């Protein structure tokens, strides 16, 4: 979309990830699997929940009876009554249709930004200890085990701990 | 090079829900909600928990005047709205004009208290006039000639119509609705056959109301086998105020009044939709609406706190991601 | 390194169109479209393909009554809206009050069927009453004293003004417009000079209509050399219904009635805009609007499926990129 | 404007490129020329065309004659007619003006995303085989002939083909 | 590296201002503005610089007719809008029905010129009629039986009430407001006791106005010790136009007329809010509003160029950054 | 926010910076000090000021007497007047509340975008002459004096001038 993450450099979604909106896919000697980042998914969930409630709860209407009765000699004010009702319908129809046409575009771009940020968070947490193979994936220059993987998902990746191992592996591969 | 991988991606499901954006249309999304309310229960429920006044065979004119067919309809002390049916032709049986009829219908659309009482008891109020022969063929009841229940057609007793002057004081403590009628006979021979005196006048007087009527005698085309006409009039009496009726003929004196307490301006629904025992907070002719959505397309003519009416057919608001389960 | 280069860039042209945004103003763009319709053809066109009714010199009151300057009643025709002019002054030549004039204008604004027929023929309905001397000096027709084309002023035939009772049943199968009038002279001598009796009454009644008219005799300031007044009335009669005229004097009996079928409530345009042969879906006093744009500023008083009126002078919408040459 | 591509790190636009909205300018020993990215250009054209239609084709108005005539004794309801007309005028004038402001800013930012993401596409495709010389341009560390130029555009750039050549070219000037 | 630092950051301060977004609420921002005008000066001020007309204890009906408790205000030169009070009781002391009261108030809301002159002088216009005893107990003036200041109740001069016929032509070149009354006595004895004639009539006629009145005699309920009623009428006279009065009794002849020029339609404020020397361009019953904001929440009833009324209580529009002065 | 700069990779804001919205914090041998970017901040000032005036000054109201008076037999038109008054109230209240909700975050995203662009502006200048230590900060590989600091703030940093010095310190650090 507007950020190029959803349907962008990450071409498709993960039907195998079911616990959240945005998340991770890892692979090591101990196996693989799909896991959703809890904080970012909940951030979108809370924001989108506020998005729906803002549109609905800002509508506050009072008791109103639209029905009006006029006789054969009150046609002029009868047509004025229709002009009021037709005018109100035209305004509300135009606003309601364009409101959804607008906030849906905002909603999709909101998810697009969230995916982009999550990639940037991991990218500016591993630095040169991993290689950007593309499609929103990282290949580790060192060996990232289950403890290492959970650190990345917890935002507590110890770069200097694995940097020396990545230093040797990178140099030998880049020979 | 050890090989371990970590990837970042987004969720996808089997949902086929589509939404529209300003730049794209029919965009499949993982999760969505509907902002448009298009569901109604198809029943006429009770605004504010108050059952409406269903008139059925009659309209408001027949119910308030007491047209024979408009017998026990609800009785009932209050209503949130008045419901007529599209085929309810039992109103004013005797032809005439109902004055300020639309205004009275709006005024009666919702009341808090409603009490019908004998303002002028037939057994004592009219000893010098004939209160029994005042029936007509235009207002049948089980075939026999009858008249409005709440009104009395006073005619000459013997061949004497003495000057009439009876008054009422509002001791109820609420506003009292008083309705009367003025008769306009076809021929002066019919005028003498009914009220003896050929030149009469009718006066109605309150602290705020003062108007005097003079009968207009001429032959009109036969409407319900009647060449005469009968206009209808109504007014409200403030509590503690006196209303005076003075006439020498052609006056349809009231027999029953209505001590009522009014509400804010409600509406009147003309629909065949059945009335069931349900509460609701919004009402439409097609049915009641029970929703928290901000828009609806069921019916523009709503009564109560209701979502705004829109021409929209589908307001699908996306909440999830762009569903991309496979890549070609 | 041969210095081969690949660059990414965007379009630019000679477009000088400027669009305002929430944060910036002007902002020259390469491609834009205007959402506001600000031009009109200056013509009064056929709305819904149906031509309008241009009274021209006359107004509605004169046209329906039949004032001598109001051409004729055309033929069995129809219209989509009524066109008057600011100079349209020929109306009720004899001073009076056209009762419910505003309401009748709205009802007559657009009809799909129309026909003028002589409901009461002049020389076969009023034998006992004079139907030739009922003219006045305030209503000239090419100089001579005359009266409305569709109305007859009945007076005593020498000295005989008996009771009148003439009725008509709506056999046309459509709504029939019946218009009459009540004459109110200045002095009772004028009352005797016209209707013999000094105490007359008029009763007009249909199935629904029931009203009895009494004349008022008093001296009023002269308007077009008339101290008396003449009010005009009208009503609609359902098919298969009888309307009764009953008067002993001071009644302006109808001559030509109108059988018609009404459209939905349309408008009346009062402007000097010429009428040409053209089709449109939106009509304004300034001119016609042939556009699908949602907004306009030509005129707030529109007729038909029209764009919403706004005070905006320009509502240009950006579609291309920011034009940044040099 | 919001992503910094247009009127940003690409200061100006090309008046020579007329076959689209976004595109490329190449230069090698064979020649130069402007070519528009028909893929990204068509996406913006379709979106913007929908954008104009969305605003226009949501105005669902009925037949209505605004003209109302009131006599000299109906001044009160006459003012009510003008209050309705003035109120409708104020509502539509305010909404129409602000709607144009909203979508003009959205349109410009939408173009900014397309230019930014097009640059991101090539940058993530060439990788280190080319040098980011700024102003939205790339300088190849190898012989990128006409066939090589077409590969980047119709994105099929064979990075491994020139990877070893660009590796030696990069180090030579690094001396 | 010879360590040198350059960072990029954003502003923060001690602001506690909170704004709301569609995705987030209670967002503390550095700087913000309030888009909703929520305060007023609490004074009734002068729209377009022109001071309003305040009637105090009197209403428009009492002020335009000249009730004895009225006319103590600052007469009239010109005004932008009319002010009454929640207790403006003193109006038509004699019971009756003021014809087209609401329509007249709309016309009188704003005027450019407004001068009162004696259209029919008392001393030299009614020689055969007694313009001295036309007072009533229902309109006291400090305990003395008085009448409306601008109207004269013409009665018989001993035993003579001839056919009155007086006319006036609009020499002022402006619009002239003329008001007159018709008395409807209780009993027929009261009819001769005041006008010496049994069957009377009243006629008023201009170039456009023409209507005749027949008195309606009947006993109404006592209102301020009055069983009769007096309906008041009004009209406007075009410049250089004759207005003709012709009555044989039961006519309350005009005494004071008003030459005036009407502005565009204005409003009428009914509030106890005091009046001061301030201009304002927006006026509400609660007070005047001087703002350039597009929305307000003071009062739905406004006169002049005013912000649109909303039910909102807070429209805090964010202008600065998100305020994050301390990272926990 | 939406661009990840504010409350993102720059976790908090600077209380010390009081001369603008966005700026820098340098520190060298001579000393340190907060200093706001006088171009981006002024540009943001113009946009937000134009934003407020666009919402405020697009409202165009005329003289109008909202109040109306009706008698005991004009209840029907009286209710129509309230339907116009309440209907206008409901339309404006819904638009006003949602307009603030929509624009508030758009302003917040606007500030988020401006901060990130400023980081990209400096990053595109320093290139490999500085090391991105994160949290919105750069560490120079060479000696940057007060004159050197102003060149970056002026957008005229001379990369070729300090390239050789940064080249030596970069690879000496590697060993
Ligand atoms: C100016 O307004 C006052 C009201 O604030 C008028 O005086 C009040 O008149 C009423 C009505 O006559 C009195 O109340 C009751 O009247 C009835 C008769 O309708 C009677 O039965 C009751 O005993 C009682 O009097 C009220 O007492 C009286 N006085 C006050 C101080 O309110 C006053 O007449 C008005 N003046 C003019 C010139 O219009
Ligand atoms: C109640 O309504 C019915 C019509 O729905 C009235 O009866 C009709 O009377 C008219 C008189 O013109 C006849 O044309 C119809 O054939 C009658 N329809 C019937 C009997 O079904 C009836 O009189 C009305 N009122 C009362 C009091 O009975
Ligand atoms: C995860 O990160 C938090 C701080 O965000 C830290 O307190 C915690 O120890 C980390 N590890 C686990 C296993 O929760
Ligand atoms: C998707 O599959 C689930 C079961 O996994 C089922 O409940 C749901 O109805 C399906 N929906 C669609 C749209 O196929
Ligand atoms: C409606 O609400 C009232 C509130 O008192 C309650 O008593 C009643 O049971 C409800 N009825 C229905 C049908 O919901
Ligand atoms: C741009 O140039 C073309 C070709 O000369 C010309 O037709 C067009 O009008 C120009 N547009 C402007 C000047 O806005
Ligand atoms: C162009 O790209 C398409 C789609 O990836 C590919 O099939 C084709 O071989 C490419 N051709 C060239 C000449 O780059
Ligand atoms: C209102 O403004 C006028 C000038 O238009 C001035 O003469 C008058 O004194 C002002 N009234 C105030 C400030 O109360
Ligand atoms: C600052 O930048 C401006 C604009 O590019 C340039 O003219 C000027 O020479 C620069 N000055 C310094 C001291 O960097």
UniProtKB/TrEMBL annotation, chains A, D, F:
It is found in: Host apical cell membrane; Virion membrane. Disulfide bonds join 144-148. In natural infection, inactive HA is matured into HA1 and HA2 outside the cell by one or more trypsin-like, arginine-specific endoprotease secreted by the bronchial epithelial cells. One identified protease that may be involved in this process is secreted in lungs by club cells. Homotrimer of disulfide-linked HA1-HA2. Interacts with human CACNA1C. Binds to sialic acid-containing receptors on the cell surface, bringing about the attachment of the virus particle to the cell. This attachment induces virion internalization either through clathrin-dependent endocytosis or through clathrin- and caveolin-independent pathway. Plays a major role in the determination of host range restriction and virulence. Class I viral fusion protein. Responsible for penetration of the virus into the cell cytoplasm by mediating the fusion of the membrane of the endocytosed virus particle with the endosomal membrane. Binds to sialic acid-containing receptors on the cell surface, bringing about the attachment of the virus particle to the cell. This attachment induces virion internalization of about two third of the virus particles through clathrin-dependent endocytosis and about one third through a clathrin- and caveolin-independent pathway. Plays a major role in the determination of host range restriction and virulence. Class I viral fusion protein. Belongs to the influenza viruses hemagglutinin family. This is Hemagglutinin. It comes from Influenza A virus.
UniProtKB/TrEMBL annotation, chain C:
Belongs to the influenza viruses hemagglutinin family. Binds to sialic acid-containing receptors on the cell surface, bringing about the attachment of the virus particle to the cell. This attachment induces virion internalization of about two third of the virus particles through clathrin-dependent endocytosis and about one third through a clathrin- and caveolin-independent pathway. Plays a major role in the determination of host range restriction and virulence. Class I viral fusion protein. Binds to sialic acid-containing receptors on the cell surface, bringing about the attachment of the virus particle to the cell. This attachment induces virion internalization either through clathrin-dependent endocytosis or through clathrin- and caveolin-independent pathway. Plays a major role in the determination of host range restriction and virulence. Class I viral fusion protein. Responsible for penetration of the virus into the cell cytoplasm by mediating the fusion of the membrane of the endocytosed virus particle with the endosomal membrane. In natural infection, inactive HA is matured into HA1 and HA2 outside the cell by one or more trypsin-like, arginine-specific endoprotease secreted by the bronchial epithelial cells. One identified protease that may be involved in this process is secreted in lungs by club cells. It comes from Influenza A virus. GO terms for molecular function: host cell surface receptor binding. GO terms for cellular component: host cell plasma membrane; membrane; viral envelope; virion membrane. GO terms for biological process: clathrin-dependent endocytosis of virus by host cell; fusion of virus membrane with host endosome membrane; fusion of virus membrane with host plasma membrane; viral budding from plasma membrane; virion attachment to host cell. The chain holds residues 18 to 340 of 566 of the full protein. The lineage of its organism: Viruses, Riboviria, Orthornavirae, Negarnaviricota, Polyploviricotina. Coiled coil: none annotated. The keyword Ribonucleoprotein does not apply. This is Hemagglutinin.
